[PDB]
Amino acid sequence: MDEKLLKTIAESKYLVALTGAGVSAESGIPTFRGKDGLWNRYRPEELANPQAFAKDPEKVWKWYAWRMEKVFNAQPNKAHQAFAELERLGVLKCLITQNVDDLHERAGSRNVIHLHGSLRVVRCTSCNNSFEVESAPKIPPLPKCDKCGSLLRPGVVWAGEMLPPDVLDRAMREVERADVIIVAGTSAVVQPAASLPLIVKQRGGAIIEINPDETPLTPIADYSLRGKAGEVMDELVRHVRKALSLKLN
Numbered sequence: 001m002d003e004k005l006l007k008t009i010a011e012s013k014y015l016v017a018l019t020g021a022g023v024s025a026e027s028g029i030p031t032f033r034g035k036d037g038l039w040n041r042y043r044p045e046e047l048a049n050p051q052a053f054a055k056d057p058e059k060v061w062k063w064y065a066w067r068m069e070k071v072f073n074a075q076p077n078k079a080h081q082a083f084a085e086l087e088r089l090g091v092l093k094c095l096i097t098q099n100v101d102d103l104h105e106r107a108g109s110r111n112v113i114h115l116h117g118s119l120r121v122v123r124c125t126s127c128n129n130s131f132e133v134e135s136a137p138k139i140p141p142l143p144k145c146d147k148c149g150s151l152l153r154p155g156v157v158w159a160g161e162m163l164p165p166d167v168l169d170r171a172m173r174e175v176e177r178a179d180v181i182i183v184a185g186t187s188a189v190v191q192p193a194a195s196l197p198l199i200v201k202q203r204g205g206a207i208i209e210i211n212p213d214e215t216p217l218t219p220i221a222d223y224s225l226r227g228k229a230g231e232v233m234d235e236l237v238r239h240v241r242k243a244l245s246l247k248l249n
């Protein structure tokens with residue numbers, strides 16, 4: 001947290017961010033990997049997989065209904081608020097997230113790309129129909145599509161499935177125009193999300209990583225703040241706002 005870092009952010013021409021589950025940990029939502037990580041307890045192959053869903057839809061839906069209620073009842077934390085503020089200040093141009101929660105939106109973020117879908121979305125397994133929910137469904141019974149005759153599924157992307165072409169393309173266009181990218185709360189192992197910060201770097205841009213742990217991205221991160229996103233982003237945006245207020249215009 002030096003003056004060079006604050007300058008890099010405050011004077012950026014097109015700053016973007018890539019966030020992961022770590023930015024929602026301080027809202028009481030568990031991460032997937034690391035301490036208390038969901039994948040250290042549960043098995044992805046049995047809960048977040050198309051095969052697992054076809055094998056036991058009730059088991060998968062009960063788990064997601066639980067995840068949904070938790071997220072819908074959680075509140076955005078200081079990290080979410082900071083990203084929203086950085087956007088309000090006109091510094092953050094776009095926020096790309098791997099999170100399926102809607103905490104960035106509830107904090108006020110306007111330009112958000114959801115690479116892996118959203119828990120607010122439910123879609124049909126057969127026909128092209130999807131919609132958003134206000135609260136979690138009760139399981140059983142299994143959610144069915146009213147349009148046709150098939151089951152509904154959470155509108156998130158599971159391992160092995162393809163991200164919507166337009167979603168990845170939009171995210172790529174954003175990082176291709178960015179000179180600075182803040183990468184917060186992500187383990188940097190899941191693709192293609194993990195490759196996005198590399199585009200910024202290969203283009204001569206700067207990477208600012210915020211994570212209490214080192215990741216595969218750390219070696220190339222211009223700055224890597226070993227702390228919690230809530231504390232780090234709050235202080236960061238506070239300093240950035242002060243810097244911007246001093247600008248002669």
Ligand SMILES: Nc1ncnc2c1ncn2[C@@H]1O[C@H](COP(=O)(O)OP(=O)(O)OC[C@H]2O[C@H](O)[C@H](O)[C@@H]2O)[C@@H](O)[C@H]1O
Pocket residue numbers: 019020021022023025026031032033034037098099100116184185186187188189190210211212213215227228229230
């Ligand atoms: N308070 C915190 N502030 C910032 N980072 C934190 C915090 N607490 C934990 N982290 C960091 O968050 C990271 C979370 O890593 P993951 O649990 O793997 O979450 P993510 O990178 O978003 O996962 C990628 C994707 O895989 C999943 O399967 C899922 O589909 C998900 O979207 C970890 O590196 C961890 O150290």
Ligand SMILES: [Zn+2]
Pocket residue numbers: 124125126127128129145146147148149150
């Ligand atoms: Zn249908």
